[PDB]
Subunit: 1217 residues, 2 copies
């Protein structure tokens, strides 16, 4: 719809519906089944011919082959008779969740139809006593309280459970058949049986509200699932194409064929990845080379860059446009209004992409999420916006799609009228044809609005011109910029520029028939305005030619001024301009700085200034910031009388451009509410000697014409000494030489909020990737450099992970990849990041993690330069360390009188910060091994100036670090023996042990050691229920052998229980319990003869282990005899004697309690225990036991969930890249 | 932005009345970005936002000349001194806080030793004492410094040294604030590490095309320095345990402007870090025995 503004009349070439042409949709994926993309106008042919997920997010590792010896993953296997070409006999298998192929904003997919049986919660209450102290039912209330907690705990956790399915595929003749276990249970042939989408099983199969497609690579080593779930990608294709057969809701070219290519990575959910794009272009390139040309691409997608002159992703774009003649359409961006805000796509290393601004016709008056189109100065100087149309996820306001479809229409007849064209001749044709809209912001568009039928005229005519196959490379001033952009800068002098203009033959200069050497290129150049000057003639016939141009800013009054140098073919001057040289000058207001703070007020007309706003008005004042200015204050109020107390809403976009930095590094975008009554005030950070743009637009008003009265006041105060903001803990006292701008109440505050540690690469393997997928034509194999890292959390905290050398750059980077994945100790996935990850904080539990970093490129010897690249882990500190300031050095070194707040006018004030004391550091519980602490240093007292005028601060840490007797030999020999008896064959140890005890009777430790051995050679370490459940069935072996193996267990626990009693009797606890709790007298009167805990705490640490090991042993026996009931007495008297010492939750006894709890039927307590263990260790065994606990409780909705965690939390392999 | 005094006098002339024709020309070019002149080895690629004063041929050079290590106080004993000598009337006993340190030279090199918090101040300091004495492994005296010792370089042979630091004052509870005071040892590096510059970031990360000298007028030029490779560091034979390297960063090409327009630069380093058989028992038992026969009474060892 809305299709009329650009054309509805070229359709009077009705046979130009989009025939013989296929568009490429780089986006969040599309949905074929959706009404409109079902078929092309043929009413029969399928439109969405292909669809990939180039991010690698949908990969599955089908590496494990297993023959269907089912008869003749994780759970079971059942599926044959389906030996349909399953040659040669085998099958591949893997596991994969799909919570990522799905936009993370669909957790509602988690519906509790049969999950809310938790609600039946039995809170057994207390008709007993009044306060906390009953004996001995305190355990009962514990057990009960703990069940309720457990239930609630699972309630809080439900939505976090991701489910992973089983995948199967084998090589039939019809291609490849893949099976997804929908019905997890019945492995029957009643599940998803999808075929290769490409090989024409181009059909969606569903789980529910989640359609799936499939591709196969690496000879069947990888499965690629494709997720439709992402609206953006669909509507984009619905505007470009969309056969509805009515020219009312139809796309712009219903006959055009679409190929969805998800370039968003679900793991980043859902950002673009260098890799993704590289793969997308790779495919395109491949398809073109192989007869199936794709003629147009459409990117409603993209971010910003820190430069244009460099980048691999960009340089590849210039190859898919120059070599494969693909017309690449991309949205200018949704980052308006403040100009110089065009983001990458299309701001790359050359004007090879068609940027499309977006405009809303007055025909559409309408009222968080608005987004102005980005304006086209372009920060290189060049021009990003090529045209406009009605309308990471560049919304596009979906008009890029429009244009894309429009470009399809032109290429319909351009090819069936047999017209030789280029991606240049097309972008060139549309440009010098469009209608400049005098009611739309000059910068927001570029060559006004697309006019198709007129642009086709241009192409039909001049079709016999060689200019159509020529590109004109325009690069400025040795940096190869694509435009002249004066914005430093107080432009009072004129300046000269050396522009290099070079002709480039469409593809390249290769014989047959190209390139017809020396295509005599003579052209003239006309300046758009008087203040720009250059020659009027230039001959390019013999290659690259330089040309000087002079800009005279002297006459230009403050504000932005634009101009262009159009060039024409001397001969046919009617071909319109061939190319343009974009000049754009910014003349800043200067603010005198002497009496009080510098202030900017718009010029006053007829008394009061008060700028007038309308639904269109965009006021952009360019101001050169005063030196010493740290922040700014924006005051504004609505003038025009009455209006009452109603509020107006204005959009403020501040934007400063810093040396080789993206526009997003000093920018603010705040929707400010303004009233007539009192003055509104917003503040923003500011940089001294550089131009600042104060762009103000009108959001929504309740009106349609207001009058704003505003001003900018400049304030500032900071440290001028060289290396302030960075302080080394071992370089003595730190100083800050503070100078303020015309008086400021100075009152500094420094809070070190998070501690960062450096992770060095353990390994750096460079490996070739796939020869099937990752190979850019022709013969360019893409290699990966895999860097491994070890992170180690000791105490749970919010942690961010980033790679300094790669972070900050997405496009415009030398390498086409970053992406790190934080892995669990169990190979699970904990987190995953890319560019700009320093901001994302994944909260980690204690334990050892792994991090993998993958860097892609085609030149191996460049990946080698990356092999030492480190990572950084920023731990959020619970307690932000606050640093004090001092005004007198000597007062600082001793830490006496602190600094006292006071005003500071035109002088220099020196403050000091003394190194942080050692005690305050260990109490900060820093990570290992911390490198530095970081925070923000604030100067001004003004509270609002504090929230904005923040200076990155860093505090770096300094590095860490008798002639033996036959008696002595006796002690040395026992220890040598004891150290052995634990690691030997228990039949050898029983001997050794005997010799030890005979020689050293009182040496009880020998008992415990034999135990550890006996219980390591004979019986598996398993928890209560897991032990019980594992004492039944399992018939694979012998029905007889099942006794000799379980009678070996009995003998052992018997032998084990007696070994404990030996360390229980001759260690009488009664008296041993007169020093620990009966301590009182610190160090026992400091007699320094018994001030040795080493002996006492030893006699007890040995005791607890004896009691502990005994109980857990006399409990297993009870289970073997099935009589925990008529044995429960001992377990109790035994458990009640341990607690008298270190409590049950200590490693020492933690899992004798688990048995006690079991024997008492306290399934609640068991949970409370098996979580303690799950906090330190986390083993599958913990979960299977935590599952069994539920089964015994009855909750099988819970246990069904626990069985899902496991499947995913303990994968077979690390997730692919 | 500060006043400069150009004072000119007459030394000796052969005459008694001359006429001087002189002028001062001001030049300049340096990095304006905040924490330049200080680069952490693990914070990725370093950048320098260079702005020159009315045109200067810019050609930077950075030589890391000496590696400094941090010495923490092993002990910090506060002790009363003499009641006969060190007592300021009337009844003010002067106490000393004695800080002990361990320095450890592995390879002979010129070394300077200084106490950051005390160095730089002689008078006008809160405490009335510094003075550190470097002692031999044999208790001999190797060196001894005070305020402004960061400049004196005592050449040390390999071996373990001791350093004592004495801080005097009459208020004990003020000496306690000093108890954590560290020292610094600057090892002169035989081979000054020379760092390369790049004009294009991407060219820097891969270490290709280096920066090419050129004039710079009224604009901003951004250069980059990539972290030093691990190999080039161990071949620099750094001390243990080095904290940072230091040197001087130069901007202008003018050779005379280089000898004078020096900027203190610092490069901080990142932190470092089966069921035995009766046969197996036999091997384990010999080793246990052998380990003994050396430390026993030789009459017992001859048996073993």
């Amino acid at each position: 719809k809305a299709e009329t503004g650009v054309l509805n009349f070229l359709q009077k070439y009705p046979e130009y519906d989009g025939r013989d042409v296929t568009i490429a949709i780089f986006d969040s994926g599309v949905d074929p089944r959706a009404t409109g993309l079902e078929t092309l106008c043929d009413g029969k042919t399928v439109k969405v011919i292909e669809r990939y997920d180039c991010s690698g997010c949908g990969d599955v590792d089908m590496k494990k082959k297993v023959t269907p010896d089912e008869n003749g993953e994780k759970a079971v296997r059942v599926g044959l008779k389906s030996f349909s070409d399953l040659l040669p006999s085998k099958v591949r298998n893997n596991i994969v969740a799909q919570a990522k192929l799905k936009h993370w904003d669909k957790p509602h997919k988690t519906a509790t139809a049969n999950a809310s049986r938790k609600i039946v919660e039995f809170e057994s209450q207390n008709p007993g006593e009044a306060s906390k102290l009953p004996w001995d039912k305190k355990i009962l209330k514990e057990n009960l309280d703990f069940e309720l907690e457990m239930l609630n705990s699972y309630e809080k956790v439900y939505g976090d459970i991701k489910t992973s399915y089983d995948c199967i595929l084998f090589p039939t003749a019809d291609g490849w058949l893949t099976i997804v276990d929908t019905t997890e249970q019945g492995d029957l042939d009643q599940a998803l049986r999808i075929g290769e989408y490409s090989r024409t099983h181009e059909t969606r199969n569903v789980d529910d509200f989640l359609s799936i497609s499939v591709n196969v690579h690496d000879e069947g080593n990888v499965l690629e699932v494709v997720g439709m779930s992402s609206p953006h990608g669909t509507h984009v294709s619905s505007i470009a194409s969309g056969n509805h057969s009515s020219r009312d809701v139809d796309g712009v070219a219903p006959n055009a064929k679409i190929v969805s290519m998800t370039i968003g990575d679900g793991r980043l959910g859902s950002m673009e990845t260098g890799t993704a794009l590289v793969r997308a272009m790779t495919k395109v390139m491949e398809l073109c080379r192989d007869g199936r040309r794709i003629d147009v691409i459409n990117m409603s997608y993209g971010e910003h860059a820190n430069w244009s002159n460099s980048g691999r992703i960009g340089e590849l774009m210039n190859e898919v446009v120059n070599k494969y003649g693909v017309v690449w359409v991309a949205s200018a961006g949704n980052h308006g209004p403040a100009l110089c805000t065009v983001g990458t796509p299309p701001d790359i290393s050359q004007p090879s992409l068609i940027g499309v601004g977006a405009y809303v016709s007055p025909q559409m008056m309408e009222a968080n999420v608005y987004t102005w189109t980005s304006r086209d100065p372009c920060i290189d100087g060049g021009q990003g916006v090529t045209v406009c149309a009605p309308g990471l996820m560049n919304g596009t306001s979906m008009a890029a799609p429009h244009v894309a479809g429009a470009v399809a229409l032109l290429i319909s007849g351009l090819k069936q009228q047999n017209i030789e064209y280029s991606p240049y001749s097309i972008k060139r044709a549309i440009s010098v044809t469009a209608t400049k809209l005098g009611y739309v912001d000059p910068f927001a568009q570029g060559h006004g609005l697309l006019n198709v039928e007129k642009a086709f005229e241009h192409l039909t005519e001049h079709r016999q011109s060689k200019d159509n196959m020529l590109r004109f490379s325009v690069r400025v001033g040795n940096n190869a910029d694509k435009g002249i952009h004066l914005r430093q800068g107080v432009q009072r002098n004129s300046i000269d520029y050396n522009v290099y203009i070079e002709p480039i033959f469409y593809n390249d200069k290769e014989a047959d028939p190209k390139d017809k050497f020396n295509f005599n290129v003579r052209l003239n150049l006309i300046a758009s305005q008087p203040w720009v000057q250059c020659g009027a003639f230039l001959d390019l016939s013999y290659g690259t030619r330089s040309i000087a141009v002079r800009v005279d800013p002297t006459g230009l009054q403050p504000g932005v001024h634009s101009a262009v140098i159009r060039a024409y073919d001397t001969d046919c001057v009617q071909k319109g301009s061939l190319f343009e040289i974009p000049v754009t000058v910014v003349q800043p207001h200067v603010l005198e700085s002497d009496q009080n703070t510098p202030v900017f007020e718009p010029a006053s007309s007829k008394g009061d200034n008060s700028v007038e706003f309308q639904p269109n008005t965009i006021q952009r004042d360019f101001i050169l910031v005063p030196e010493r200015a740290t922040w700014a204050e924006l005051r504004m109020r609505i003038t025009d009388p009455n209006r009452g107390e109603d509020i107006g809403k204005f959009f403020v976009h501040t934007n400063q451009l810093l040396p080789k930095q993206s526009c997003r590094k000093l920018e603010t975008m705040k929707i400010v509410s303004v009233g007539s009554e009192n003055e509104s005030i917003m503040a923003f950070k500011v940089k001294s000697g550089r131009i600042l743009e104060l762009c103000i637009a009108k959001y929504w008003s309740n009106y349609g014409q207001s009058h704003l009265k505003y001003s900018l006041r400049f304030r500032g105060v900071e440290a001028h000494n060289p290396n302030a903001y960075v302080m080394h803990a071992g370089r003595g006292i730190h100083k800050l030489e503070i100078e303020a701008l015309v008086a400021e109440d100075v009152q500094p505050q420094l809070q070190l909020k998070n501690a960062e540690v450096v992770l060095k690469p353990t390994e750096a393997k460079i490996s070739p990737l796939s020869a099937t997928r990752d190979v850019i034509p022709d013969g360019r194999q893409v290699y990966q450099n895999l860097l491994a890292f070890n992170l180690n959390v000791a105490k749970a905290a919010d942690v961010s992970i980033y790679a300094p050398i790669f972070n900050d750059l997405l496009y415009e980077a030398e390498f086409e990849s970053q992406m790190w994945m934080l892995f669990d100790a169990n190979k699970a996935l904990v987190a995953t990041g890319d560019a700009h990850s320093h901001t994302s904080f994944t909260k980690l539990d204690k334990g050892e993690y792994t991090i993998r970093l993958q860097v892609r490129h085609e030149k191996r010897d460049l990946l080698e330069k990356i092999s030492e690249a480190n990572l950084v882990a920023s731990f959020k500190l619970t307690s932000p360390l606050t640093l004090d300031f001092y005004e007198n050095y000597n007062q600082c070194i001793v830490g006496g009188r602190k600094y006292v707040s006071s005003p500071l006018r035109l002088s220099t004030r020196v403050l000091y910060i003394a190194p942080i004391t050692q005690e305050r550091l260990t109490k900060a519980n820093l990570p290992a091994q911390c490198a530095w602490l970081s925070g923000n240093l604030v100067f001004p007292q003004d509270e609002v100036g504090r929230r904005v005028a923040q200076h990155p601060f860093t505090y770096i840490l300094n590095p860490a670090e008798g002639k033996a007797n036959a008696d002595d030999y006796a002690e040395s020999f026992r220890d040598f023996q004891c150290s052995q008896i634990v690691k030997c064959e228990l039949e050898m140890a029983e001997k050794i042990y005997n010799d030890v005890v005979a020689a050293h009777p009182k040496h009880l430790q020998a008992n415990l050691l034999l135990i550890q051995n006996i219980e390591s050679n004979q019986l598996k370490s398993q928890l209560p229920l897991t032990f019980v459940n594992a004492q039944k069935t399992s018939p694979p072996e012998a029905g007889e052998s099942a006794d000799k193996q379980k009678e070996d267990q009995k003998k052992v626990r018997s032998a084990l229980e007696r070994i404990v009693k030996l360390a229980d009797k001759v260690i009488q606890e009664t008296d041993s319990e007169a020093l620990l709790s009966y301590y009182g007298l610190k160090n026992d009167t400091r007699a320094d003869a018994a001030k040795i805990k080493t002996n006492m705490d030893k006699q007890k640490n040995t005791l607890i282990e004896a009691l502990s090991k005994k109980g857990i042993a006399v409990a297993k026996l009870a289970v073997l005899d099935d009589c925990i009931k008529d044995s429960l007495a001992e377990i109790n008297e035994l458990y009640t004697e341990i607690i008298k010492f270190v409590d049950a939750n200590d490693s020492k006894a933690i899992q004798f309690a688990l048995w006690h709890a079991y024997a008492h039927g306290h399934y609640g307590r068991m949970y409370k225990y098996v979580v303690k263990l799950i906090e330190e260790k986390r083993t599958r065994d913990h979960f299977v036991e935590l599952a069994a606990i539920n089964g015994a409780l009855g909750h099988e909705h819970i246990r069904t969930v626990i069985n899902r965690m496991m499947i995913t939390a303990f994968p077979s392999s690390f997730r692919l890249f």
